[PDB]
Short mmCIF file of C-alpha atoms and ligand atoms in Angstrom, two decimals:
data_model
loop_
_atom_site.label_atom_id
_atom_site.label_comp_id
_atom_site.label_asym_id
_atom_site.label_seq_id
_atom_site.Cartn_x
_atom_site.Cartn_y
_atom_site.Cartn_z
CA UNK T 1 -148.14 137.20 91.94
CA UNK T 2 -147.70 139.51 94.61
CA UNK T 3 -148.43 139.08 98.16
CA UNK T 4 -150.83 142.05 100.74
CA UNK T 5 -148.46 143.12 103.34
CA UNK T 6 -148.46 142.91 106.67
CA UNK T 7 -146.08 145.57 108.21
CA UNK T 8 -147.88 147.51 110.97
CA UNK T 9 -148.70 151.15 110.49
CA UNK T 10 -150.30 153.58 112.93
CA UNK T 11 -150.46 156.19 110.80
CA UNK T 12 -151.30 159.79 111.15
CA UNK T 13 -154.13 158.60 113.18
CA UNK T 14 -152.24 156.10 115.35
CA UNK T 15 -153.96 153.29 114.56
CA UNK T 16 -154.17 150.19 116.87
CA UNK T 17 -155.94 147.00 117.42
CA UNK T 18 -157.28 145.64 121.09
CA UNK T 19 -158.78 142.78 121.94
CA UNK T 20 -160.86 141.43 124.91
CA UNK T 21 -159.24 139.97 128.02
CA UNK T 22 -161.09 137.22 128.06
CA UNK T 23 -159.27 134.04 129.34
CA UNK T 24 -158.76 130.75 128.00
CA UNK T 25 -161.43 128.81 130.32
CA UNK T 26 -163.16 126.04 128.59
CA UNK T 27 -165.73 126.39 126.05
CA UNK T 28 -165.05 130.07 125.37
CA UNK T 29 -166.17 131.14 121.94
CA UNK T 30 -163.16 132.85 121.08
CA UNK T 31 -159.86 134.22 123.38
CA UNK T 32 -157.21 136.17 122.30
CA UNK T 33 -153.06 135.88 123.68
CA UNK T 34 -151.37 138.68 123.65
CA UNK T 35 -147.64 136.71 123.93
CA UNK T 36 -148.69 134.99 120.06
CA UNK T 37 -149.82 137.80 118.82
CA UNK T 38 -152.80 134.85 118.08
CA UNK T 39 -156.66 135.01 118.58
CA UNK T 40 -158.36 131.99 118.78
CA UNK T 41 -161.89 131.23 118.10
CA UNK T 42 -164.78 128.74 116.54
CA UNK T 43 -166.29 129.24 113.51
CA UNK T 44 -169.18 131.40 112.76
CA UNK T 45 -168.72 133.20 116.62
CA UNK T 46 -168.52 136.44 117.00
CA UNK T 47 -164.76 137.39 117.84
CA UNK T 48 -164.87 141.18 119.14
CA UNK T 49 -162.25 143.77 117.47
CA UNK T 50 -161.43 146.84 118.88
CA UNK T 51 -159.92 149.58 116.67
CA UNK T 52 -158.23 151.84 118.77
CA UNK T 53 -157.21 155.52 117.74
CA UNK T 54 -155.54 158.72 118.37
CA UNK T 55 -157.58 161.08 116.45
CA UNK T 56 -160.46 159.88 114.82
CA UNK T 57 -160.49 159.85 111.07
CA UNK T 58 -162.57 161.95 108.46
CA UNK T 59 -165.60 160.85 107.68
CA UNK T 60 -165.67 158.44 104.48
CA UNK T 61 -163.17 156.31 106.25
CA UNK T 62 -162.96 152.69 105.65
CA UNK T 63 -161.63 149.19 107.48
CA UNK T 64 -161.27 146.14 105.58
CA UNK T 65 -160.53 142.92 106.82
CA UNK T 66 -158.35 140.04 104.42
CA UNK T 67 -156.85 136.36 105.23
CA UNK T 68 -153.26 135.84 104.29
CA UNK T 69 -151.26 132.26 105.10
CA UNK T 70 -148.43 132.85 107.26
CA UNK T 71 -145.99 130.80 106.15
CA UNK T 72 -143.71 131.97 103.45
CA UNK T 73 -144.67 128.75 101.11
CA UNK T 74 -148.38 129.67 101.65
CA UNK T 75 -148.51 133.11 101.13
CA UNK T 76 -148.81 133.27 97.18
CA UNK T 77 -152.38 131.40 97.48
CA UNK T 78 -155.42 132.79 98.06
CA UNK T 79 -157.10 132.00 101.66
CA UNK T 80 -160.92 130.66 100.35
CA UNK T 81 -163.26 128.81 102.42
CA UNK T 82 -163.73 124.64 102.01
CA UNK T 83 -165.47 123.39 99.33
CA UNK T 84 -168.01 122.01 102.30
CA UNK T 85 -168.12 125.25 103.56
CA UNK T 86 -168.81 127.09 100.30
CA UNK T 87 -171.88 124.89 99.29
CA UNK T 88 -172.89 124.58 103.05
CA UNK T 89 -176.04 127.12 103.12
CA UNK T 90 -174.82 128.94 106.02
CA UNK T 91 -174.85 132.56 104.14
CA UNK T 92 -176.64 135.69 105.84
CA UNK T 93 -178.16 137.00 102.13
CA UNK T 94 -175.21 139.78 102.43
CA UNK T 95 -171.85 137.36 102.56
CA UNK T 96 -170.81 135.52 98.93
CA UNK T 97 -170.34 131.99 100.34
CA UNK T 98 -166.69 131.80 99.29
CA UNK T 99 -165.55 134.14 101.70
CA UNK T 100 -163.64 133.40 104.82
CA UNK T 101 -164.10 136.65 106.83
CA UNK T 102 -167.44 137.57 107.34
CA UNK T 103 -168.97 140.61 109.78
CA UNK T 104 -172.19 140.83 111.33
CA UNK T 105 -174.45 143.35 112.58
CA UNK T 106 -173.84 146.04 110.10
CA UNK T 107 -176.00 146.03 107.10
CA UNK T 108 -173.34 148.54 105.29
CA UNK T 109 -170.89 145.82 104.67
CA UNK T 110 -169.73 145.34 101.17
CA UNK T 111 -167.26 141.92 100.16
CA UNK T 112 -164.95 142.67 97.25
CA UNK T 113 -163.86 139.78 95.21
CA UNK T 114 -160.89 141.65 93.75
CA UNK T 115 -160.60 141.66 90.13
CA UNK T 116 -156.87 141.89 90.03
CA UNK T 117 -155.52 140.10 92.74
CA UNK T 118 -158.45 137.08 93.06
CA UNK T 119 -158.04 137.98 97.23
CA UNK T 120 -161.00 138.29 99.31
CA UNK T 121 -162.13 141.03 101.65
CA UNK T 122 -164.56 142.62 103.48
CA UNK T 123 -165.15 146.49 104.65
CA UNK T 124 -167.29 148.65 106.94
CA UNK T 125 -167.89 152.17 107.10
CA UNK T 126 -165.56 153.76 109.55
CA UNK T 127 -167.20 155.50 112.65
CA UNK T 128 -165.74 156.95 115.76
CA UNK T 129 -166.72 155.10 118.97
CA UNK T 130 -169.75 155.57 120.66
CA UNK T 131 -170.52 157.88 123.27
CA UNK T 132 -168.89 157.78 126.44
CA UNK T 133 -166.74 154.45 125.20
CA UNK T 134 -163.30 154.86 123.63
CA UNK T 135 -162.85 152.51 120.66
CA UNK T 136 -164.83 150.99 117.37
CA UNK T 137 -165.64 147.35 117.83
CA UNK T 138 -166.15 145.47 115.01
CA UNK T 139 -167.60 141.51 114.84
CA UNK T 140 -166.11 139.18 112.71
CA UNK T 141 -166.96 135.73 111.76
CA UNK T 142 -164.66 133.52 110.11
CA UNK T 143 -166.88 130.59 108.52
CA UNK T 144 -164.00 127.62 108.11
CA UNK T 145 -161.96 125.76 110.98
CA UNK T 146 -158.23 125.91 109.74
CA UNK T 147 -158.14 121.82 110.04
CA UNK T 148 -160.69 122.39 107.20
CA UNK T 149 -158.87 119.75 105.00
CA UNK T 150 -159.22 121.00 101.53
CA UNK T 151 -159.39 124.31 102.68
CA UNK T 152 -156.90 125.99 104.55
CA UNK T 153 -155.50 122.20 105.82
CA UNK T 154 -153.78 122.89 109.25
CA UNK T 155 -152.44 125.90 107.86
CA UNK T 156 -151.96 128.75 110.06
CA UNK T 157 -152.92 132.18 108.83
CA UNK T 158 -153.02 136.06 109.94
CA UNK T 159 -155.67 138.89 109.39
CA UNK T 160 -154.73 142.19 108.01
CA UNK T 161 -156.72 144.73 109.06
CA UNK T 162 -156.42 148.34 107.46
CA UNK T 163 -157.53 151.86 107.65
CA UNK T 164 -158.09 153.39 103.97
CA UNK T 165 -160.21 156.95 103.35
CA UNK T 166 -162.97 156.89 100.47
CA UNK T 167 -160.50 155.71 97.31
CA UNK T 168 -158.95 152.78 98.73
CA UNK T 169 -155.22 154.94 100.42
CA UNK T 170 -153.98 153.12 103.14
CA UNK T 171 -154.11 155.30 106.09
CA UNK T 172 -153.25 152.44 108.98
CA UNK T 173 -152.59 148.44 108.92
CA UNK T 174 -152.35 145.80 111.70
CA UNK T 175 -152.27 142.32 111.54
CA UNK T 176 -152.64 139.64 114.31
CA UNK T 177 -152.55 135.47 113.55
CA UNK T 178 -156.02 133.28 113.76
CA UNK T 179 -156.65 129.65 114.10
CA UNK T 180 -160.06 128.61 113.97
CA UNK T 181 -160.57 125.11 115.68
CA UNK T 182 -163.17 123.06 118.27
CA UNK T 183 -161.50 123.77 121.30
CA UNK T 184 -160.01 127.35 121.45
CA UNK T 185 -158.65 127.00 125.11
CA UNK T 186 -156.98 123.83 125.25
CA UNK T 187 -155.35 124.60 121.74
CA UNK T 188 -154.51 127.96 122.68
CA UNK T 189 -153.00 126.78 126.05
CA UNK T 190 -151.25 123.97 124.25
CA UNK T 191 -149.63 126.51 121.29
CA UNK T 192 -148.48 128.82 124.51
CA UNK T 193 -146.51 125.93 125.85
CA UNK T 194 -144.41 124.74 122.83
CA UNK D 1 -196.41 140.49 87.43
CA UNK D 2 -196.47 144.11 89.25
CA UNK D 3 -199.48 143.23 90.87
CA UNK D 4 -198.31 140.09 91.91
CA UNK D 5 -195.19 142.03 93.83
CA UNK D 6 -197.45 144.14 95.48
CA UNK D 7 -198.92 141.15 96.95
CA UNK D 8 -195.71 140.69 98.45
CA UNK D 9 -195.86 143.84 100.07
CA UNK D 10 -199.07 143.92 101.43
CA UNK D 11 -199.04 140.05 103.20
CA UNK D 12 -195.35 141.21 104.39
CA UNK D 13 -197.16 143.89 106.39
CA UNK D 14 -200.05 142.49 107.35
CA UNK D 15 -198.16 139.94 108.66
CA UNK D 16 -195.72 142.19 110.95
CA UNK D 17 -198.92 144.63 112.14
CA UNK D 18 -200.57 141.31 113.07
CA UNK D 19 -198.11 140.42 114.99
CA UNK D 20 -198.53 143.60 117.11
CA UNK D 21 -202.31 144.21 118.46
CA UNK D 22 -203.22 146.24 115.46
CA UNK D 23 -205.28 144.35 112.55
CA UNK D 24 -205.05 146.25 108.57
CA UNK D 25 -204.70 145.34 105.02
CA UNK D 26 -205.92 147.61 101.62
CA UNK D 27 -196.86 129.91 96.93
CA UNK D 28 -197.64 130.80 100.66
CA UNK D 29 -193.58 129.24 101.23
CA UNK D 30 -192.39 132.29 99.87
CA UNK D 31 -193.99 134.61 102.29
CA UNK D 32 -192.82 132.09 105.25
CA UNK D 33 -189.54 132.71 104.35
CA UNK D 34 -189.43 135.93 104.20
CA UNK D 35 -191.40 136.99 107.04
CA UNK D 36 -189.30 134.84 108.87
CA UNK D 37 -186.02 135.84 107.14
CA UNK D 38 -187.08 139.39 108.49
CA UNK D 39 -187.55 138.42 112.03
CA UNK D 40 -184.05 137.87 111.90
CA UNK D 41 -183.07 140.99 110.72
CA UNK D 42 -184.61 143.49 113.37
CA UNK D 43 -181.94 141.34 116.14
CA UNK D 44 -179.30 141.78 114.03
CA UNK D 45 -179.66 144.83 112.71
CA UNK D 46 -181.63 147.23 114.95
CA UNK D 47 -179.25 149.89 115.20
CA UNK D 48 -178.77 150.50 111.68
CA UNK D 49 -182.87 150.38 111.20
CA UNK D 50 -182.70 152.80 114.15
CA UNK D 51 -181.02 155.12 112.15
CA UNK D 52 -182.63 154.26 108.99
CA UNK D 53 -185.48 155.30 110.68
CA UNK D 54 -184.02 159.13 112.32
CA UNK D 55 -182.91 160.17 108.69
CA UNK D 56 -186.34 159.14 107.48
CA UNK D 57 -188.29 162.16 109.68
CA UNK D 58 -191.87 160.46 108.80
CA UNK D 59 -194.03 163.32 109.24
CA UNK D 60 -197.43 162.99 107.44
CA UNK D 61 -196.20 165.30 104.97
CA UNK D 62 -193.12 163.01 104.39
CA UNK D 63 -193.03 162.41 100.22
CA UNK D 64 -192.13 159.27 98.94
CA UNK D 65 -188.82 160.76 97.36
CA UNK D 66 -187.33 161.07 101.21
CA UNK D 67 -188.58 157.13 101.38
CA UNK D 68 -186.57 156.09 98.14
CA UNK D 69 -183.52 158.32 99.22
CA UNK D 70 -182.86 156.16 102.26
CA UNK D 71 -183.77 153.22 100.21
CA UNK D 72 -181.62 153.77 97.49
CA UNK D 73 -179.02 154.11 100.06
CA UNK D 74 -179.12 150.60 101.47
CA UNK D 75 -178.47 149.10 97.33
CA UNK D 76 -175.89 151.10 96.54
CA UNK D 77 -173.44 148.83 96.45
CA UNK D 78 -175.69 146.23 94.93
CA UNK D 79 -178.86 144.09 95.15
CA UNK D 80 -178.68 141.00 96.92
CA UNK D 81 -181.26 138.67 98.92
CA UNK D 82 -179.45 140.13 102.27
CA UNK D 83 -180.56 143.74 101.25
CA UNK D 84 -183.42 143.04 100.07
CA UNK D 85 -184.55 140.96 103.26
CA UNK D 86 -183.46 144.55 104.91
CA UNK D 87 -185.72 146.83 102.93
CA UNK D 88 -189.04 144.80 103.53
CA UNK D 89 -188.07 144.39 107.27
CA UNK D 90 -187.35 148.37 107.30
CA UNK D 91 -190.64 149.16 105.64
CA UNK D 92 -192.51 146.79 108.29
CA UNK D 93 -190.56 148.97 111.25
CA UNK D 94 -192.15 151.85 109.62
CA UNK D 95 -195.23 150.88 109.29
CA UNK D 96 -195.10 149.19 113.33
CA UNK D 97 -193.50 152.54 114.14
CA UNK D 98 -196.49 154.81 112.43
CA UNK D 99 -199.19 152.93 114.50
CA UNK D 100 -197.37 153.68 117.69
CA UNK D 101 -197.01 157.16 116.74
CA UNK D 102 -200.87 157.47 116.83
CA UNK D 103 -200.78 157.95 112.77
CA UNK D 104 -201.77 154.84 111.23
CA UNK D 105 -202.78 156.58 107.81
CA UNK D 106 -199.39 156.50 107.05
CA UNK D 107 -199.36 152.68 106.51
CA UNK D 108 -200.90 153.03 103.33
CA UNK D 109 -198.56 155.33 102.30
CA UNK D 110 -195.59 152.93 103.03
CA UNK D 111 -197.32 150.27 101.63
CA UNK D 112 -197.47 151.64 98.25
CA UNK D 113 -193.76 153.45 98.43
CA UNK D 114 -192.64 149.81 98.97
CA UNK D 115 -194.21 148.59 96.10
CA UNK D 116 -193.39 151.30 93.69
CA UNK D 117 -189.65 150.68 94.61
CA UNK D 118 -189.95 147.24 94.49
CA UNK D 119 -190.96 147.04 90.71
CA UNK D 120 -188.89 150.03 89.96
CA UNK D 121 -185.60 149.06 90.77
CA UNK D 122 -185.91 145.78 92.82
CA UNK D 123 -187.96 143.63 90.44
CA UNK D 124 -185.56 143.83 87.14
CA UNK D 125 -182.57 142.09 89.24
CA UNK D 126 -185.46 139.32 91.12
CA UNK D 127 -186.12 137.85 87.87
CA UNK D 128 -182.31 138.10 86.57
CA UNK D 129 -180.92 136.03 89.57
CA UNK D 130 -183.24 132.79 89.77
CA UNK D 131 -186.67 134.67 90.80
CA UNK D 132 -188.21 134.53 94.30
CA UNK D 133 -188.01 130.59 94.27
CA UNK D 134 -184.25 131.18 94.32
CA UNK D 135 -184.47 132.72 97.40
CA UNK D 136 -186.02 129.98 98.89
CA UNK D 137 -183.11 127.60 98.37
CA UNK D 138 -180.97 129.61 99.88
CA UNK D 139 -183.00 130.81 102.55
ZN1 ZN X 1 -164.29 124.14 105.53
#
């Protein structure tokens, strides 16, 4: 009945999200505008997350990833993939077809189908960044266009991601809005204009 | 049936050496997905095999219990195709990474950790979730 939330939180380890600057040029995979608050992108592309911090967490630490609709009539239901999408046989042997979110490259991922809530999610091992760099990356995939009719249905939604040590605390949350479509420049473009 | 699973094990190897210069060994659909299936997996995952690997200090002397610790790392939240796919891929890098190491004995050794594992813990969830020939529709 309840609904995640989305109210930023650096934390004790002053958690904060980057993004690439990568412009919105035609046929880019996925872009990111700072003004919206809004990354665009194409489904199953990798769209780059940085996880930026101010001192790096124990050891144990986790970040999980979840889909919430944005608008207040929306944000009761659950954000699942298309039935198209589910049956499509587009899975990677470690992602449950239903889910939305998806991350590759790390075979430690684990996607929790919560029990409680029915919400879906997915989480990676924490580590610091690597040598000589200064932030975790993470690649998501998000496996359903938001004009999925059926689906999400032009609905537009945010990600939450959040920082949480080995029992599920929350140590850090940010949140940034997604729209997953053909054309991620012109529609992100045409959104910065209205 | 546990002979038939070390089948698995042994054409899944031969396969990957072959595919390197070196030559060894001790329906066919199934292995084509899977070798292929595994192909995959070294591009996506090579880092984490990488470290798979560093943890894993394969000496000669190396026991199989240091083998099934790693292992038993990548299931613990689970079986699935995905990690599954990951374990016979990781025991192929092994087994490519022995040869280069000038100790090719220790592809026998693999071999047989691999299939102890497999029927041990692997083999009691295969049959439970559609058998190898439900791997094959989904992969
Ligand atoms: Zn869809």
């Amino acid at each position: 009945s309840s609904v995640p939330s989305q109210k930023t939180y650096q934390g004790s380890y002053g958690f904060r999200l980057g993004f690439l600057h990568s412009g919105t040029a035609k046929s880019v995979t996925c872009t990111y505008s700072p003004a919206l608050n809004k990354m665009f992108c194409q489904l199953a592309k990798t769209c780059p997350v940085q996880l930026w911090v101010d001192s790096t967490p124990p050891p144990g630490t986790r970040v999980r990833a979840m889909a919430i609709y944005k608008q207040s009539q929306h944000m009761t239901e659950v954000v699942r993939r298309c039935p198209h999408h589910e049956r499509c046989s587009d899975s990677d042997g470690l992602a449950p077809p239903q889910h939305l979110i998806r991350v590759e490259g790390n075979l430690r991922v684990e996607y929790l189908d919560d029990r409680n809530t029915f919400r879906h999610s997915v989480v990676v091992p924490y580590e610091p960044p690597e040598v000589g760099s200064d932030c975790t990356t993470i690649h998501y995939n998000y496996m359903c266009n938001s004009s999925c009719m059926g689906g999400m249905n032009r609905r537009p939604i945010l990600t939450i991601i959040t920082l949480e040590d080995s029992s599920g605390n929350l140590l850090g949350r940010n949140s940034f809005e997604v729209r997953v479509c053909a054309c991620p420049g012109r529609d992100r473009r045409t959104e910065e204009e209205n | 049936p546990s002979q038939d699973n070390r089948e698995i094990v042994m054409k899944y190897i031969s396969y990957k050496l072959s595919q390197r210069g070196y030559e060894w060994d001790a329906s066919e659909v199934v292995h084509q997905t899977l070798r292929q299936a595994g192909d995959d997996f070294s591009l996506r995952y090579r880092r984490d095999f990488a470290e798979m690997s560093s943890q894993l200090h394969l000496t000669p002397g190396t026991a199989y219990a240091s083998f099934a610790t790693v292992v038993e790392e990548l299931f613990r939240d689970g079986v699935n195709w995905g990690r599954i796919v990951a374990f016979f891929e990781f025991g192929g890098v092994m087994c490519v990474e022995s040869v280069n190491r000038e100790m090719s004995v220790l592809v026998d050794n693999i071999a047989a950790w691999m299939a102890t594992y497999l029927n041990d813990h692997l083999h009691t969830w295969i049959q439970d979730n559609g058998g190898w020939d439900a791997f094959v529709e989904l992969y």
